[PDB]
């Protein structure tokens, strides 16, 4: 969808928090930093 | 192909004026010299004047100098000759001659004729 | 500064493009052939009057 500056990617599943696109989905889970996954 | 066209001549009196003229035809007139050359009845040639390609004078005789005017015309491509104060020592077959080479402009000043015509016979008596 | 409010909620904004800009000036033309005759006409032999 682009580069996404400013948050790491886990490898783990989660339900979608925020819709980034082609499947990527972002949320703000446990230090406290913004994830994707 | 050269067609150097001669006009203006005939029986004057010594002191009047006259104009001679040589239009060309066959070749470009902005690019040659043409220089007017008198010849005397079986005593040789004598140069009178010349003019190059642009408007510009090269010299006179020892004894045609203030009395004869020359110039040139590229809108009419012809090449004029006034004359003035004329004596019984002016009598002579007055050729149209032109130049061979182009007149670029760095070279030696060495001017030869080329092409010749047929004169006209300007008589003073 | 775009929601026009001091409290923006959880989501994606659209707030400006990325837009990489100039780093030079390139004005190319073909080369120089056939010079106009400019050296018979200011370097000239005599002139007449």
């Known amino acids: 969808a682009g580069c996404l500056i400013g948050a790491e990617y886990v490898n783990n599943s989660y339900e979608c928090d925020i819709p980034i696109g082609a499947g990527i989905c972002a949320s703000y889970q446990t230090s406290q930093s913004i994830i994707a996954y | 192909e050269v067609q150097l066209v001669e006009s203006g001549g005939g029986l004057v009196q010594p002191g009047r004026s006259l104009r001679l003229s040589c239009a060309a035809s066959?070749?470009?007139?902005?690019?040659?010299?043409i220089h007017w050359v008198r010849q005397a009845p079986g005593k040789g040639l004598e140069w009178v004047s010349g003019?190059?390609?642009?408007?510009?004078?090269?010299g006179y005789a020892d004894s045609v100098k203030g009395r004869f005017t020359i110039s040139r015309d590229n809108a009419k491509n012809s090449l004029y000759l006034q004359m003035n104060s004329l004596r019984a020592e002016d009598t002579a077959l007055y050729y149209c001659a032109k130049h061979h080479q182009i007149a670029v402009a760095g070279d030696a000043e060495d001017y030869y004729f080329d092409y010749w015509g047929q004169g006209t016979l300007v008589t003073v008596s | 500064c775009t929601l026009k409010s001091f409290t923006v909620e959880k989501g994606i904004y659209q707030t400006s493009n990325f837009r990489v800009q100039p780093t030079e000036s390139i004005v190319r033309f073909p080369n120089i052939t056939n010079l106009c005759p400019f050296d018979e006409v200011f370097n000239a032999t005599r002139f007449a009057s």
């Open positions: 066959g070749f470009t007139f902005d690019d040659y010299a």
């Open positions: 003019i190059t390609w642009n408007s510009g004078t090269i």
